[PDB]
Amino acid sequence: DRVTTQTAGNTAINTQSSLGVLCAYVEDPTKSDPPSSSTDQPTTTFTAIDRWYTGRLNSWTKAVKTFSFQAVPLPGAFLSRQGGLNGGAFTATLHRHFLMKCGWQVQVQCNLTQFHQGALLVAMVPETTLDVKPDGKAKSLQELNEEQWVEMSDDYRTGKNMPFQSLGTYYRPPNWTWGPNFINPYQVTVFPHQILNARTSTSVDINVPYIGETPTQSSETQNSWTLLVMVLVPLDYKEGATTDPEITFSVRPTSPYFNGLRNRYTA
Amino acid sequence: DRVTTQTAGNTAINTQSSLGVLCAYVEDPTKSDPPSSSTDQPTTTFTAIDRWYTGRLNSWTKAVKTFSFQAVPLPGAFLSRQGGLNGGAFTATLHRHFLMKCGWQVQVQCNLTQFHQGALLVAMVPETTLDVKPDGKAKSLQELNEEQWVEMSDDYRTGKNMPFQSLGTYYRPPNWTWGPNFINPYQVTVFPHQILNARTSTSVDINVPYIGETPTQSSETQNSWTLLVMVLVPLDYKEGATTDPEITFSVRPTSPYFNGLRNRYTA
Amino acid sequence: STDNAETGVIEAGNTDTDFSGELAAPGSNHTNVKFLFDRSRLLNVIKVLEKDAVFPRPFPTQEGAQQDDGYFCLLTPRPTVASRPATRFGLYANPSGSGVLANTSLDFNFYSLACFTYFRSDLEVTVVSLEPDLEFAVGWFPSGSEYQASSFVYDQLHVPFHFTGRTPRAFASKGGKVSFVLPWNSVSSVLPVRWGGASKLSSATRGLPAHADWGTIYAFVPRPNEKKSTAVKHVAVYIRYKNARAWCPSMLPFRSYK
Amino acid sequence: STDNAETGVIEAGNTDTDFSGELAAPGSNHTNVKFLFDRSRLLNVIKVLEKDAVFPRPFPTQEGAQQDDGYFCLLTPRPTVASRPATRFGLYANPSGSGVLANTSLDFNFYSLACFTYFRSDLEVTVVSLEPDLEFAVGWFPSGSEYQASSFVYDQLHVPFHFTGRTPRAFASKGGKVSFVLPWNSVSSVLPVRWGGASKLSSATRGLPAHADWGTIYAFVPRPNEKKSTAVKHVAVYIRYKNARAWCPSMLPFRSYK
Amino acid sequence: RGNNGNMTFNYYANTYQNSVDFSTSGILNPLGYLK
Amino acid sequence: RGNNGNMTFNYYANTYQNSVDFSTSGILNPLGYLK
Amino acid sequence: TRAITNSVYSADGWFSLHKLTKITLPPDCPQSPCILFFASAGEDYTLRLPVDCNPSYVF
Incomplete structure (x- = not known):
């Protein structure tokens, strides 16, 4: 009933408190047709990229407040290697193809005990720049491993701090107040989500298809999804219990359609 | 009649003085069954390794004597990058699979004019250590680019200088006289060969299947074929003609069956 | 008969191809590989054991190794040395001294007719x-x-x-x-x-x-x-x-002209 | 594959049970008990009689018994001593002296593959x-x-x-x-x-x-x-x-780790 | 049949060569059954 | 058949005398084809 | 079936039990639990070529 083993390629993952795969926006998000914006023959899936790529994510202490999120860019994590999420044969194929059109299928493991309380809001959030510092630069692993959980200020609730083109010295620099890549933290449950509660499950299961403004997007620029782990209830436990439960995540690209083969990406 | 364009993947090569593809040992050396010594599912061909990998080979002066050969190890040239023969998606797949079972299909271009004389003996030679120095070490590109054409001494005709296990200080070191990886230079035409004459063709065409003592061989050790370019008649020309004609070669692996996936080979 | 030997395939012709003649009869089948290699020949001359020997240690064997040599016949046409498979065949031209004269072997009758790679x-x-x-x-x-x-x-x-x-x-x-x-x-x-x-x-x-x-x-x-x-x-x-x-x-193998 | 080994029965699985794969071919039948034990091996080395011997008296044999030892081969894989069935096998580490060195025997090739009780x-x-x-x-x-x-x-x-x-x-x-x-x-x-x-x-x-x-x-x-x-x-x-x-x-038998 | 390659001809009979049991009145089955 | 003149009678069987290959699942053709 | 010569420490590779998440025990439970290992043969494990045994079990 709740023991579901999800074999894919040569990497089968298991979960004995499974709530069920949250297939998003369609019945089967695996089914997808080739891109209509490529006259060349696309590189479809093959048996070394159809597997569960797994990397760690930061721990979840008691000091983490409500709505302190933590964002995983997909496919931004395969390229920067956030959390040790090394793609292997997928990243070595993603760097050599210019356009990439895939749908994801994630699973976040955080095993609490029956004496802990707390709830994460794991949600595949489309089209957000939550991984980018407000000054334009994307975050590096030295920068993620010092804040550990990016707290929900009012700059994220309003979208005041999304990255921008500086107007220059000619225009008077205006008082920025809002930007559409905000987070409304109370409405993240509209996204494809499950709640990683401390009393119903250890792992959540989300399955999202390819979305994007174009029928296929570039490989080195896109952030079409964002695995967002948000703390709705802070972790609390009596002393003696297992402090700082780990959080991992396991990402599987469902049916990718690579296009535009060239040499390895050198910025 | 003689204008044959050999399209493969995204790399089509052309020859307007084609003698014909010398399909070796069988009618169609492309047809091959999976290895019987692997219970795992083999990685077959795909559309980024089914193409013509091309790299240069050394020039052919007048100073080159009769029987001065020049050997290309297959797949030893994809890994050491001899002559700039960079595999790309093939070498990046060959390093990650432990066993590899393929058949080759080569083509050597050396365009003479009608006023030059000479003849090469391009021949896919099975199971020779002609790329290895007699002291055991395989040749590097700094070592190939100083002799340019490894002359046929009597150490190669007898096989006196093939690599060996040193017996140690216990046994008296015996006077070595012979080894089975010799070259009989007068009998290289038993191999799958064409003669690159200066008056019939510019390119030769050889197509050989997978041979080997095992139903599939290792990836980092094998030298099952050896593209051997041997000078049967020395180049001669009157002065004013185009000195030092180039020699290239174009290698295509026909139906490879990779096995045993692991991380990238680190010796 | 007008041909191109740069092609790499030459059709083996008879006297009637160029001239007036006829095919000779088939002589015999003594070139048959299952027939030609099916005959005995001397491989190695090994000394007969008399005690429980130590098998030869793997190469490089150092001095002071009290092992027993010249005793084991590694049954192979390929060149051997010290009862172990080798790459070169080496006899002793002047065996004076000096250490242990290693027992080598080779199938002389095989390699003169081993015009192939696998057997x-x-x-x-x-x-x-x-x-x-x-x-x-x-x-x-x-x-x-x-x-x-x-x-x-x-x-x-x-x-x-x-x-x-x-x-x-x-x-x-x-x-x-x-x-x-x-x-x-x-x-x-x-x-x-x-x-x-x-x-x-x-x-x-x-x-x-x-x-x-x-x-x-x-x-x-x-x-x-x-x-x-x-x-x-x-x-x-x-x-x-x-x-x-x-x-x-x-x-x-290369027959020298001297 | 999720199992419970406290049950005492574990279904022997293949690579395809957890992963993607296939069954290997059946190798051979050299583990067949009627085939594996059907080969000769040295059991005991007994001295050849030359006179009408006295058979060894039953245990405990006392001194002064003028019997003839080391002569009879009780044909058994189990440990014997003095041509009579024993329970322990005992060799002599330092056989200096002292009485009559009793002929013991054991089938070394049997008990390494006697993974059973009755035979x-x-x-x-x-x-x-x-x-x-x-x-x-x-x-x-x-x-x-x-x-x-x-x-x-x-x-x-x-x-x-x-x-x-x-x-x-x-x-x-x-x-x-x-x-x-x-x-x-x-x-x-x-x-x-x-x-x-x-x-x-x-x-x-x-x-x-x-x-x-x-x-x-x-x-x-x-x-x-x-x-x-x-x-x-x-x-x-x-x-x-x-x-x-x-x-x-x-x-x-227990293979020691020393 | 064991380690017996003499497929053709048994000179001595069954009760002399072997030793048959006297009456009274592949497929590898497991040696332990969970019931 | 090789260098075998004993046409009549094979005492030992096939798998004992020879060594047959295990399954997985004259006319002198040329060793190289111009195609 | 026996690493005689050579296989350097590498014949068919290595089994290795990594722990992924730490074992989260409730209070008043023993630290260091014990994973009991077995080793069985597959349903396609097949043996060949008997040899003389090692008689060093009796010494």
Whole structure:
């Protein structure tokens, strides 16, 4: 009933408190047709990229407040290697193809005990720049491993701090107040989500298809999804219990359609 | 009649003085069954390794004597990058699979004019250590680019200088006289060969299947074929003609069956 | 007949192709590979064991190693040295001194007609004694096994462990011979006559096949170690390649013109 | 594959059970019990009789007993001592002195593959001489009989009573061997490899089966007692387990880690 | 049949060569059944 | 058949005398084809 | 079936039990639990070529 083993390629993952795969926006998000914006023959899936790529994510202490999120860019994590999420044969194929059109299928493991309380809001959030510092630069692993959980200020609730083109010295620099890549933290449950509660499950299961403004997007620029782990209830436990439960995540690209083969990406 | 364009993947090569593809040992050396010594599912061909990998080979002066050969190890040239023969998606797949079972299909271009004389003996030679120095070490590109054409001494005709296990200080070191990886230079035409004459063709065409003592061989050790370019008649020309004609070669692996996936080979 | 030999294929023609003539009759089939290799020949001359020997240690053997040499016949047409597979064949032109003269072997009758790369056959070993009235025996251990090197005290007699085993220890009669046929036991599909790959047993020696053999025989004397004689007795190993198959044509050795 | 090994039954799975793969081919049937035990091996090295011997008296033998030891081969894989069935196998680490060094025997090749409790088979005894030009013979008496120990004066020659009988006295040729196959003669249905019951022949020794044997052979010389030679000649007993059957799986011996 | 390659001809009979049991009145089955 | 003149009678069987290959699942053709 | 010569420490590779998440025990439970290992053969595990055994179990 709740023991579901999800074999894919040569990497089968298991979960004995499974709530069920949250297939998003369609019945089967695996089914997808080739891109209509490529006259060349696309590189479809093959048996070394159809597997569960797994990397760690930061721990979840008691000091983490409500709505302190933590964002995983997909496919931004395969390229920067956030959390040790090394793609292997997928990243070595993603760097050599210019356009990439895939749908994801994630699973976040955080095993609490029956004496802990707390709830994460794991949600595949489309089209957000939550991984980018407000000054334009994307975050590096030295920068993620010092804040550990990016707290929900009012700059994220309003979208005041999304990255921008500086107007220059000619225009008077205006008082920025809002930007559409905000987070409304109370409405993240509209996204494809499950709640990683401390009393119903250890792992959540989300399955999202390819979305994007174009029928296929570039490989080195896109952030079409964002695995967002948000703390709705802070972790609390009596002393003696297992402090700082780990959080991992396991990402599987469902049916990718690579296009535009060239040499390895050198910025 | 003689204008044959050999399209493969995204790399089509052309020859307007084609003698014909010398399909070796069988009618169609492309047809091959999976290895019987692997219970795992083999990685077959795909559309980024089914193409013509091309790299240069050394020039052919007048100073080159009769029987001065020049050997290309297959797949030893994809890994050491001899002559700039960079595999790309093939070498990046060959390093990650432990066993590899393929058949080759080569083509050597050396365009003479009608006023030059000479003849090469391009021949896919099975199971020779002609790329290895007699002291055991395989040749590097700094070592190939100083002799340019490894002359046929009597150490190669007898096989006196093939690599060996040193017996140690216990046994008296015996006077070595012979080894089975010799070259009989007068009998290289038993191999799958064409003669690159200066008056019939510019390119030769050889197509050989997978041979080997095992139903599939290792990836980092094998030298099952050896593209051997041997000078049967020395180049001669009157002065004013185009000195030092180039020699290239174009290698295509026909139906490879990779096995045993692991991380990238680190010796 | 007008041809192009740069093509690489020449149709073998007769006298009638250019001239007026006829085809000759088919002579015989003595070039048949299953027929031509099916005949016995001398392989190696190994000394007969008299005690529980130490098998030769792997290369490079250093001095002070108290091992027993010249005793084991690695049954292979390829060049061997010190009962182990080698890449070069080396005899001793001037063997004065100096260390241990290593027993080498080569099948002289094979490589003159081994115009191919891969060769698979059974092996019919006949072990002819080179000593009058010798009552010996012949061991064997397959391609991949190792010599069982010790003894067990049977009634105050150090009977060695090479008197028994699950492998054939054929005992010869007094003044007789030992003849038996060994199957293709090695883990390779075929024996490479010429090999170009690398065996990764050591610092990887190019061109050295690790399991190109039918095994390794050794002659001993059926007495315990107290009855060890003094004069070292030899024996001679004749092998025959039953049911020979050969693939992938290749070169014959270079006959020098001097 | 999710299992519970506390149940005691685990279904042996393949690669396809957890992963993507396939079943390998069946290799061979060399683990077949009727095939694996059907090969000869050295059992005991007994001295060849030259006179009408006294069979070894039952345990505990006291001093002053003028009996003849090291002569009878109780044909059994189990540990024996002094031609009688034992429970422990004991060799002599430092045999200096002191009394009579008792002939012990054990089937080394059996117990390394006797992963079972009960074993029934026929026995094919081959008695190889360990002496040049020995003209010997081989007696036998079944599991439950006893040695006939006397002589009868035939023409002023003390011919012993072990030259005749209703049991096979096979006579070897000069320099030959003796080979014959003995049926399962013992009164037990099977031979216990491991036994835990008590035999009530004596003060009841636990774990000692009284009739777990195929009998007892002995080598003699076909001359009367006047022609008794001086040097004690040995012989070697090779047995083969024809038509082996084995029941009730059990343990293999403890390989020490030192 | 065991380690017996003599497929053709048995000279001695069954009760002399072997030793048959007297009456009274591949497929690898497991040695332990969970019931 | 090789160098075998014993046309009549094979005492030992096929798998004992020879060594047959295990399954997985005259006319002198040329060793190289111009195509 | 026996690493005689050579396989350097590498014959068919290595089994290795990594722990992924730490074992989260409730209070008043023993630290260091014990993973009991077995080793069985597959349903396609097949053996070949008997040899003489090692008689060093009896010494």
